[PDB]
């Protein structure tokens, strides 16, 4: 027969199954290029599996390999398209955990598309039977690839100019309770909070269009509350209108309405998806709007150290898509946050370049190729009694948000807003004069001193004095110093 005579007898392309590390997916003597995409994975092999074979399997199944030999490989420049595992190291103070570095060719990805990049890196590797657990810890995205993405629509610098606000963190609050209020009652809270001294207020992530309140009603009343407050104070004000919806057409309809009534900003949720997010960031740039991103759902895969994706990677992907704000943690609030890991997140979102810093979880040096900066947002069970800690851990480019910490004031919403602004102003002034505001004694005294000229602040300090959330963290570092 012709078929039998034309059988491939080459050692590499003869039919059958061979190890991934003998298929060309492991290369300890590999030289990395400045155009290559790189990934760091924390792998846990099944009892009996060789650490190097596991790394080679992850590289092959995330690039061009399958479980058995295929001759069709000879119709392509195979060597150029194969990903290559090049280093494997045991995780310190651990047995059965190893770090693995992998390099990918630039031509494997579609320009400007996050769905495509993720389809390769996280497509099916996490479900492989030969591994018991797996976690993507970091990535190095090259200058060449960064240039095919838009980056933030507004950016921190242009945004401060749009608000005429410079040299201090911005302030905000969420409307409470989460659900149940009508459009007219929603506008009343916005008017009150802004008038007391907040820069912005926001709808809860779960507020969209429901039987108790339809969206068009909420948008109209909110613009009346914003204009009233701005005319009474002489400042630019705003509220995050939520445009999250079930279909792309409905999203666009809500974005075009908010622009028509003159909103300076709008907000979206992470549950919408990568492609809907990319479309929204392109629209905001073409229509002069600020875009806020709520990270609903992130903790389903970013909480445990043994399996999933580390938040610092999500930070990079979202800065590439082009969002203007993103929730990043508080350290002292009611949600999870280790101080060393959080400092790493803030740096990834605000710096022009990153240098290796193991104790902070920074594994790769990387430049941002002049992409604009993304503004971090701190929210979740925090109060004016903790002002000294917030200034020391979060920095100056950040939005501090107080929901229960404002509406829960006994003397009204306007009183709550005033207590928060005064506390901040006094702390920054003291800092700029060279005081040790972080000391457990100096910090609180500074607030106490300011309180003796502002009744609202005195009331708040006495109310939430002994309030704290101390619990062991889940996601921690693997290095020290």
């Amino acid at each position: 027969s012709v078929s039998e005579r034309t059988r491939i007898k080459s050692d590499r392309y003869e039919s059958g199954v061979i190890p991934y590390a003998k298929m060309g997916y492991w290369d300890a003597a590999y030289a990395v290029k400045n155009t290559d995409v790189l990934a760091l994975f924390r792998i846990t092999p099944q009892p009996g599996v060789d650490p190097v074979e596991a790394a080679a399997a992850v590289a092959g199944e995330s690039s061009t390999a399958t479980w058995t030999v295929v001759w069709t490989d000879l119709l392509t420049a195979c060597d150029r398209y194969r990903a290559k595992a090049y280093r494997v190291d045991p995780v310190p103070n651990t047995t059965d955990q190893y770090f693995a570095f992998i390099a990918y060719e630039c031509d494997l990805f579609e320009e400007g598309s996050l769905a495509n990049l993720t389809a390769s890196i996280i497509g099916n590797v996490f479900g492989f039977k030969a591994v018991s657990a797996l976690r993507l810890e970091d990535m190095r995205i090259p200058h060449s690839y960064l240039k095919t993405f838009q980056g933030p629509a507004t950016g921190v610098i242009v945004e401060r100019e749009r608000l005429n606000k410079y040299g201090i963190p911005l302030l905000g609050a969420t409307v409470k309770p989460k659900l149940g209020l009508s459009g007219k009652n929603y506008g009343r809270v916005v008017y009150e909070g802004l008038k007391g001294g907040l820069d912005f207020l926001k709808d809860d992530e779960n507020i969209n269009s429901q039987p108790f309140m339809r969206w068009r009603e909420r948008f109209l009343y909110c613009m009346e509350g914003i204009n009233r407050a701005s005319a009474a104070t002489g400042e630019t004000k705003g509220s995050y209108l939520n445009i999250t919806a079930g279909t792309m057409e409905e999203v666009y309809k809500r974005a075009e309405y908010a622009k028509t009534v003159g909103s300076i900003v709008v907000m979206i949720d992470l549950v919408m998806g990568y492609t809907a997010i990319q479309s929204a960031a392109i629209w905001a740039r073409d229509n002069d709007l600020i875009l806020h991103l709520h990270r609903a759902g992130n903790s389903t895969y970013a909480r445990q150290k043994n399996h999933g994706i580390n938040f610092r990677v999500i930070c990079k992907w979202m800065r590439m898509c082009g969002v203007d704000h993103i929730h990043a943690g508080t350290v002292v609030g009611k949600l999870e946050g280790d101080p060393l890991m959080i400092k790493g997140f803030y740096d990834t979102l605000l710096l022009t370049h990153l240098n290796v810093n193991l104790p902070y979880g920074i594994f790769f040096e990387m430049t941002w190729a002049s992409l604009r900066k993304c503004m971090p947002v701190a929210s979740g069970g925090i109060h004016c009694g903790q002002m000294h800690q917030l200034v020391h851990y979060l920095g100056d480019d950040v939005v501090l948000q107080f929901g229960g910490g404002t509406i829960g004031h006994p003397d009204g919403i306007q009183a709550g807003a005033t207590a928060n602004r005064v506390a901040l102003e006094a702390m920054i002034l003291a800092r700029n004069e060279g005081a040790d505001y972080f000391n457990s004694d100096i910090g609180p005294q500074i607030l106490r001193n300011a309180a003796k000229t502002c009744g609202p602040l005195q009331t708040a300090l006495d109310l939430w004095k002994d309030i704290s959330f101390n619990y062991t963290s889940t996601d921690t570092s693997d290095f020290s110093v």
């Binding site: 030289a31 990395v32 790189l38 090049y86 280093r87 570095f101 290796v356 040096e365």
Partner: peptide, 9 residues
């Protein structure tokens, strides 16, 4: 260690 900065030019 410090070989991670030299192994990734």
């Amino acid at each position: 260690a410090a070989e991670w900065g030299s192994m990734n030019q």
